[PDB]
Amino acid sequence: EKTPDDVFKLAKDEKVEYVDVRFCDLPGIMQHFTIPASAFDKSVFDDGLAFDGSSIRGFQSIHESDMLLLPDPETARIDPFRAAKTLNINFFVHDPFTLEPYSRDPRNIARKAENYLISTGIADTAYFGAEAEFYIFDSVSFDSRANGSFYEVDAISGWWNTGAATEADGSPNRGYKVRHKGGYFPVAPNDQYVDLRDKMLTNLINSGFILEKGHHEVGSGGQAEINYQFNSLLHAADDMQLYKYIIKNTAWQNGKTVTFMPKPLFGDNGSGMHCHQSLWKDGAPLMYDETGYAGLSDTARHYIGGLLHHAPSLLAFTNPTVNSYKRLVPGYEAPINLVYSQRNRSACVRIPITGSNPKAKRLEFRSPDSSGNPYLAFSAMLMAGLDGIKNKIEPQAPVDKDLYELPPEEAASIPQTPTQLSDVIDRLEADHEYLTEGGVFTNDLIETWISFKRENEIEPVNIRPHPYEFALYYDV
Amino acid sequence: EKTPDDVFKLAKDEKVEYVDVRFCDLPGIMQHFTIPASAFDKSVFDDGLAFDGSSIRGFQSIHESDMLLLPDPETARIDPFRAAKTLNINFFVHDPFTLEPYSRDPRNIARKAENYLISTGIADTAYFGAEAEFYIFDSVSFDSRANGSFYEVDAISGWWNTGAATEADGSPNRGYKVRHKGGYFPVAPNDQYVDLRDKMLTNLINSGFILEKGHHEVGSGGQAEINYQFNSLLHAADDMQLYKYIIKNTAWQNGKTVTFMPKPLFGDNGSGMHCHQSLWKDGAPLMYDETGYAGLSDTARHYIGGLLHHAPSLLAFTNPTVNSYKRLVPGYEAPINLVYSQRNRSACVRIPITGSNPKAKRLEFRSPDSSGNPYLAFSAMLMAGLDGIKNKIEPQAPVDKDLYELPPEEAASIPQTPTQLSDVIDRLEADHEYLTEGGVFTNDLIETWISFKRENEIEPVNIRPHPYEFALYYDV
Amino acid sequence: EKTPDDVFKLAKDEKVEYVDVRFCDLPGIMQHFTIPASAFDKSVFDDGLAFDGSSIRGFQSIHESDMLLLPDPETARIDPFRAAKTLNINFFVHDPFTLEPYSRDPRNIARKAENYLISTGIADTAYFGAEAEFYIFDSVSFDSRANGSFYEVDAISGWWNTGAATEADGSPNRGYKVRHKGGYFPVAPNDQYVDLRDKMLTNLINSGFILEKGHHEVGSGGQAEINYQFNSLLHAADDMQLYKYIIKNTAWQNGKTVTFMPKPLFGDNGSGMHCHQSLWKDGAPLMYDETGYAGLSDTARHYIGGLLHHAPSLLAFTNPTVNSYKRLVPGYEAPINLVYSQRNRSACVRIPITGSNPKAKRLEFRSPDSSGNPYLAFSAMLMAGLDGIKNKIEPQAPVDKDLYELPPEEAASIPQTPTQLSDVIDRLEADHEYLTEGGVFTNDLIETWISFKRENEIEPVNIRPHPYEFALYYDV
């Protein structure tokens, strides 16, 4: 409930030199420009500020370029990195003529989703808790040419380096490198990132995050995870974007490089963005029933029914990259089919063991990753869950087994996760009505998304020969 | 019509030291072992020779390993490369108990296809003329690891080398390199492979090939093509396998390395295997009608109808690799949709301009490549064409335009070529009855093929991150 | 007057293994493919041979690709370079349906030009003598990237190398390098290319050229010139193409690299293609009049009038590249304005001093270079000259001065040569009627030429920053 004057006071008290104006592009990267403290006045709140909509992905064409920005005082935070004292604020994108909210502003979609939820009477609050895992690498390089292509990531703790004569700077190999699938979570010196993760935890604390934990993750070569307290949809998506900024730049300032890509390593764990979800109304929880499987109420079970039913199109917003589908393979604690199960890290929806406290009851949607847009992803998940409640969609029976080790004939009788991005985009195009309910998603957004993924991602990868095709086929 | 005694005479006259026993594996690579001249006797013809069927792809399991081979005297040729005088002969694979022909011997499939054609009364001879294009490279390297993957091909004439300070051996850069899409076909010194191609042409002539032409092809970095006289199905497939052997080894002996892979270069022409086809009966041609479009008879037009109708599954045998589908992209004289058209190198079936001579009338099926098995590919094409004649399948009207430059709304009303290998394999699995006619293809062959491609090709590429995913997604 | 049977006899007597089928693309590079001797029969003369017209510049589109070739027995010569005995023959391009000559075959244009000349009654023979100068370099490299671009040529005799510690192979610098503008023409060891030019002279003699001289030219870094006997238009253009092939490949086989580009060196002489021209009728010369300036008849003077009047558009075919206009600068024995003058190497047309022999009387058109198509260039020159005779166009008075030393106010009073390629192309577009007389050039040819130069040459150079722009402007 922060006000314009609250932000002006914060700026004065902190002796801010610059204000960094931020907003979200369609794919999911934050955009920014800087104004001096002297130019940060009431006119910023009253009239807004302009930018070139044609240079932003999924936004405007060149002849309709000018767009407008209006501040969100809830999102004002001091930047931990800039030597000149800087205040970061997120903005909403508006039409420069009518001052109406932009149909392709991701932050608007989240706003609309929250208001639609209230309008259904089902609940008044949707809580999102997320676990954005990442890799702390030392280096990366890659190219793509007519006659060749390559990539390489590297990290001191990568198992591929056990036989190295020296480290990259010429210093001795001192062992204690992380085995593949072996990073979760031995003490130092096996864990070579303790001090860096502490700096990440501290930078988050100093940016107003309420912290829960930090640890090394399963993957070799510096996989990590940090958890902060859940929040309502829009706040949670704003938290995600700032979290990624703080992780990436703490690493950068300390000589490292971070990636949130779903699957940077072949034959080791990918990086997921599990989303814990619950609905509340009038300050009371709605997910709990002592007599249901895994202690779940009807509302909760139908929300799951919606998620698993809509998955074939929903993944276009929750798993939105070509790389996403290299993670959805068996053996790495990511989903390979559409089942819910308690305590089950091989499942698509896991129900965490929380006991008899009704407040703690929730579902963990394990399918999503961090390769896209949290505003759009959280919103799409909500729309799928709500369609499930409204149409009382029953999920198929929980399967309490290692889903990777299912016998072939039982495995076949269960719907699989989509194989590739082109499949989920096709399915989104064919069936997206649940998303357009209440105008939360509009057709122009959905069509822009489909077009962007095909032209900029699917096709560019499809036309380029893969290095493994040379391993397979050079001698045909 | 060569006999056992004809081959024994050839071996004696040529003072042969060794006999190289050859046969075809299922994917399409020739296999061999050597016996001394003293061990080449009538018993080889009467009893045959044994091998380990479990070490050959698409053949036997380990407990049913032993298999038998019986010579085909038509295929006896002197090897141009071995210092010790060697006679090469192709063999048919047989069951070691019953002496029945093997259901998964590619050379048997071709045999069966030819006999089935005769049994239909439609014709007695199917002629296949093929153009197997290739690249004459200088080097290749590639790998696939947990944290990285690469490939690189290289050639002195590659345009990517115009700015090189020196050649690979340290000698000066002397220019005259080939522009992308610019290799067809300037005189030397632009054409840096004239003498090598002459050696290829001579080695073919000395192996009993009847030669027609040789030239540099469109692609930079040493693309080439050589044409030899067409023949009946089985002979033509045998010719193809020996041709590839002679091309590869002439190159090898002269310090080069050749690939027949469909698309080794990104942004330059792929290498195709166009198949010219015609049916004959009682020594008379069946493809010609003065009054048809492009001078085609009903029999010819229905054969085309069969090819274009069955394409979605047929390509599993004619375009059988993951790399195949990197070639089926617009702008490189390869098909992108299922149309026939005269004079048209952008089409799926081109009708060459041959004039009023009825003997010369034929179709050019431009879709196939050299990345698989010519015995299986020629056979499958025939089966599709015959199903077309038998069911009088009418092809959709010819389109006499640049098919790459079609307006979006006309382009959509035409069936496209398949996007990827997994699609054609799926389609083969669902619909393959035309192939099983007369038992030419059997279900065990089709099921083995589908299984091999999924487990050994489709899945291995799908699980491995592509270098371009790092270009697109590292900073998500 | 060679016949098909004359060529068959030559092939048999020389024990030819291969026949190289050659034809000219529109810009001016010879194209080829090879057939075995066994495939060289009467059918080649009767039916011709096919090729892909869509892969040849200025020819066909992809849907109308098939084209036909018919041999010219006058052009059969033994190849001096190929280890396998080869006979080269030039072909005419024909329509594959109607067998009519192709409107965009350069060799057809020359054919038509010769026949048109006869039809005018003016003369029956146009003689062309050409001097194609060239550089014998050691190496060349160049590229063009987003952030940088370079070229470098090199030669042992280049003056830029006088201070080199060693030669490229590590051997000592032994001096005797050529000074800029100092190559014409000191004895060896200053002249470092005597033996190589002797090899060029011998290869030409053995290919049926009648030789006149060879020498080093003005430019440092191995400039050279060889002269062979003049001939009638078509024969002369065929001679030029073969001469360029023999020069380039003699160099290549001897460790060097040759360029015919107009201006490879900045601040030293360009390479021209001076064209000596005369008209004859009934075996009698037409250029001579004892009483005319420089001994020229009215016919000759009007031919010159035509050349100088039509120059602004004519240079589109005689000086057809962007690089052409780097040579048309003062101080290097190339034209900078449109004057004729006897004995004058600074003029556009020089009249060589030949004495009172009427047979030797001729004009030297000094403007043309070797960067395009001799068939088109010779033809266009003839058409301009004939328009001059027909309309009795009077050239402006001869100027017997060093045209590089004129003060700027006096320079201005004479029409200048065009500054850049875009200007001559524009002018060709606006005025080309003299070329279309008798259908020698057709509109489709002229329009294709204009389009090719704009899209493939003019525009690509215009959009790319020049290195010297960085010298001038980095610090603006």
Next chain:
Amino acid sequence: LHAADDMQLYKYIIKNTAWQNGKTVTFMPKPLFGDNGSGMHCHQSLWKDGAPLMYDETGYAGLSDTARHYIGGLLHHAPSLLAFTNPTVNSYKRLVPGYEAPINLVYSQRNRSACVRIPITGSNPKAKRLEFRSPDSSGNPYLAFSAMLMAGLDGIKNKIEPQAPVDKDLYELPPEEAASIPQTPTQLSDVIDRLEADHEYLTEGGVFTNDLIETWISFKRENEIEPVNIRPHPYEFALYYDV
């Protein structure tokens, strides 16, 4: 004048902050091939007695007659005006389609592909202005600002009407629609030639004199146009080595 003085000092401060911090800055129009050039867009407005003159609620893009005629002058005089606003050989490598720089002489509101864009500023009359997108930083801001003003003033004085605004992506216009629109000049030699032929609007009131104009023309020809013209381009070797 103050604005031109500001420009010069700004360039000094940018270049030397970079220098002191291990970097190197260029203001050249097109240092990268296949990526955006660097422009110097000039927003312009006329005021009198402390009141704005560019605004009319009823005009297209909210422009008064004075403003529209100023634009008429800019687009009419462009063929010679660019000699002072786009004064280098490199300037014309930026004037190519696809990079938010002009390729023809149109004005249009909200349009970053246009020669003059009218920024969206609302109903406040004080904020009303034109953005002349053609100029770059490769020359002289004193001369460039002055020449723009002289062109705009000739437009007002002779009430020169600009051709109708075109509200489209101007790089994507169909063949014959684009062909009815005057293009921007191709190269420096063309604008210098045109300046030589027609420069009367500049000499009004003796703001520019003939000795200045003649010195400018002479300098560009001898020191820039000719030195580039005589030097072979690396791409000529890519195109022509094997002719």
